[PDB]
Amino acid sequence: EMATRARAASNLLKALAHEGRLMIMCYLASGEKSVTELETRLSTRQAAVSQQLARLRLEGLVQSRREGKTIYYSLSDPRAARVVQTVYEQFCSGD
Amino acid sequence: EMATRARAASNLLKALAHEGRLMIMCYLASGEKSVTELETRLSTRQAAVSQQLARLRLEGLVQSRREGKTIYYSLSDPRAARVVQTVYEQFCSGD
Ligand SMILES: CN(C)C(=O)NNC(=O)N(C)C
Ligand SMILES: CN(C)C(=O)NNC(=O)N(C)C
Structure with a gap:
């Protein structure tokens, strides 16, 4: 159905519509990354990265x-x- | 630069992270559509469609x-x- 798939799509986009979460996803889009690698590449503060990873999970x-x-x-x-x-x-x- | 392109991407996603605006964009993704066709396909109320089109514009x-x-x-x-x-x-x- 068009409605329920539109809500799932809309929900993905809400999760992606955040600069920090989007950057995490972009880094994972090239392959698996350790937390150490993610924090090395991100300028985000560690507490923020931790919440963002939890949200994506x-x-x-x-x-x-x-x-x-x-x-x-x-x-x-x-x-x-x-x-x-x-x-x-x-x-x-x-x- | 990674930051300014991440903000433009994040802004697109914010515009798309709305069920009504996303459905409009999905319909336009298959080609040009008249307003009459869009409202025929959408269940959204006309005032809402009008604001959503304005936002996408x-x-x-x-x-x-x-x-x-x-x-x-x-x-x-x-x-x-x-x-x-x-x-x-x-x-x-x-x-
Ligand atoms: C054509 N059809 C039944 C359908 O579900 N298409 N898929 C979508 O329109 N979205 C927004 C996921
Ligand atoms: C690799 N590089 C300099 C670059 O800009 N890549 N693009 C992005 O990372 N985003 C989020 C648009």
Whole structure:
């Protein structure tokens, strides 16, 4: 149905419509990243990154695994992955 | 730069992160549509559609032309067009 798929799409976009969460998703769009790598690449403060990761997890958009003492995040919803890949390609392209 | 392109991307997503505006964009993603066609397809109330179209116009995402007494809207930002096409394809696909 058009309504329920429009609400799921709208909800993904609400999760992505935040500069910090979008940047996390863009970094994960190129492959799995440790938390250390994400924080190295992001200028966001650690407490903010932590909430943002939790929100992306709640929304079903990221998952994570432990390897030793490292936490690796990755994209988990393939619809969101493709949307973010399009955003990343389109908005990182110069004119 | 990563910051200014991340803000433009984030702003597109904020404009898209609304069920009514997203549905308009999804309909325009398949080609130019008259206002009459858009309102026939949308269940949204006319005053709401009017504000939503105005917002999409302000954001640079849609443009329009007049042919006789008909107003035709179309997508105007190609980055947004591709993002919406990915949303439409991904979220209209069944499992
Ligand atoms: C648009 N966006 C979030 C993005 O990251 N684009 N990529 C770059 O801007 N560089 C310099 C790699
Ligand atoms: C055509 N049809 C029944 C359909 O669901 N298309 N998908 C969408 O329109 N969205 C907004 C996900």
